[model samples]
Target: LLSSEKLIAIGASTGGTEAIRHVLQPLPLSSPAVIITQHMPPGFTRSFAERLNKLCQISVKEAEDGERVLPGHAYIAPGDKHMELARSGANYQIKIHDGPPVNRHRPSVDVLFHSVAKHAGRNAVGVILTGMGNDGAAGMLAMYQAGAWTIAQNEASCVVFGMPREAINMGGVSEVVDLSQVSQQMLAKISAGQAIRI
Candidate 1:
């Protein structure tokens, strides 16, 4: 009964705000739970999530520790607080905590991705978007190694390309797609029925 759960984890850096938005905007309200980490200072993520909530079909908000994760809602890691996933019986919960920066990022994508790699395993989809750092590369590899599907934004569509470049170079990405096609690619992966396992 707990085998069909699917998780989407996104990581980004320098030019990630708009890039992340494009991916989220096209996703339907029925989309599986999504968690995001983008480089930003304190006080920005709340407003950022609030802004996304108004624009997207799915509910978007800054994650609260211990909050149950559900389909059709998206969570953003609060600035300076690392977000991780944990299980509660057959349900998923988010853990928010203050931790030393990973790869020089406070709300490091690596931290979140690594947690998803461990907890969600094959039930996760890891996305590395337009960004300026290599923080998520190693963690995304962990997800791929764990049998999760992974994707990275293509070089031409990324503003910085550094993050995606590093991730692709690390050989974790299952595919590379343009920003405009990101949402479509994601849904295709899920619809392929590869998310369910016995």
Candidate 2:
């Protein structure tokens, strides 16, 4: 088990629902704190979280303000709002923002990743999944600059490789792993106790 607190965060857009299922299905219940931002409309994300929680062993819920970071739980950023991580003492939580959309997305992946960099810093593991826009590339870079491990899903499995491609080209990614292996690779790193310190 890793010694330091770890936060695994994912950003996805088109073709993301199935991608989330694939990533979370085999994940052990002892998984670290997780948060996901998938392009979706209001109500869909909440239902999605509920549906996933029913199928997966881990707790899956739409993110709420001040919800503490905890293992075995996956928080999905609510649609139409930005989810920002906040450091509360030694622990971490979330703050939802109802601001104008960034890059035409309210629940902007860029904003979420950027917040993770500021709040969680080296404790974060960032992943950019299949998407049709470049919303997450710059923020993933910010996470990398803040000393977080980052990964992008390979092009082979992406319905649209826009986000990950941009991130990879910009040297923001640590690994460009296949879709099937993305979660496993992250789990391996965490299990091996490899951690980044900002």
Candidate 3:
């Protein structure tokens, strides 16, 4: 179960629970591995992951430190900790620790994207969703420079356009779409040229 076809790094904040839910609900068992962060306060991510698992077609789990990742599964960054990606031999791994906060948020989106830029490269994609800060822009640029595809949420549908706007202005985003479009875009970007809908 711990393997991947392609990988994606996703970030959100400020009403992103629903937005994240919207993006993830359409994925199927053949989808790519997703490394996600939602800028949540500590203590509720376990319940959050459970709720996502109940709602999504793919597996959703709060990440555990040093755990191996799986294709078609989403590993949400556990609250209050930074989550990074690692490659153990031929498979990807999750690296979770209580590192210092970035952009005033632990479990930083930048940290996640930075790791993805290094480990996944052209086989990876990064999506920045509705959020209230410039947290993900620079890292999305890093991902783009690393030959990863990048996406951003549109201001019209975003609760707050800070995050995605910054990324777009940075010239890293390959596309700018709405909340409803996120699921299809992601599945399309990471698809192994196979049917992806649930």
Candidate 4:
């Protein structure tokens, strides 16, 4: 079961569909609640989440407006909307809204990471995965500066390497790990029920 005290936030763009599946597939049902933003167009995110739902052990779905963020489940940002972390009486929930694109993407990674930094603070874990562009770099840095544990997929394992590369170069990442180890390492922190001190 996921602990309400901690959360995992992930961002990705090009080449992320397979990358995301790889990360979520190995995780157990007790894994922390996860919020994800993948640069994609309308109609694709739902299918992507449903596809992962079938392949992975945990629940996966495109985030609905005002839904409670639950453990053992992963929420995917809608392709045409920006999803952010919102609090409802001490509980974190998703707030979906229509906004101009940030960093040239509707469901921008920067938006998601920034919200995590603002809401979850040290209770959050940020991961920037395989993708093209620097959309998430600054927000990841914000999360890092806010005392959240940050991770980036090493260039060697990234399909495009642009997103994680930018985050690493900006000094936002706490650890650089191969793609294969990403999920395992994330789960390690989740199971521990605390942020990795950095």
- The best-first sequence of candidates by lDDT reads 4, 1, 2, 3
lDDT of 3 by residue, 30-67 (tens): 77788898899777778899999998889999998878
User: Residue 46 error for model 1, in Å?
Assistant: 0.2
TM-score of 4: 0.94
**For model 4, what is the C-alpha lDDT against the true structure?**
0.90
Write the residue-wise lDDT of candidate 1 on 1-198 in tens digits: 224778799999888899988899887877889999989987899999999999999999999999999889999999988988888887899999898999989899999999999998988889999988799999999999998889999989999989999999999999999999888887667556644455
For model 2, which pairs clash? none
Full-model lDDT for every candidate: 0.89, 0.89, 0.87, 0.90
Better of 1 and 2 by lDDT: 1
Q: Which runs of model 3 end up more than 4 angstroms from their true locations? A: 1-4, 192-198
lDDT of 4 by residue, 50-152 (tens): 9999999999999998889987899999988999988898789999989899989989899999999999988888999999999999999999999888989
Backbone clash count, each prediction separately: 0, 0, 0, 0
Off by over 4 Å in 1: 1-3, 194-198
What TM-score fits each model?
0.95, 0.95, 0.93, 0.94
Alpha carbon RMSD to native, model 2: 2.5
lDDT minimum window of 10 residues, candidate 1: 189-198
lDDT of 4 at 69: 90
Q: Give the RMSD in angstroms, all C-alphas superposed, for model 3.
A: 3.1
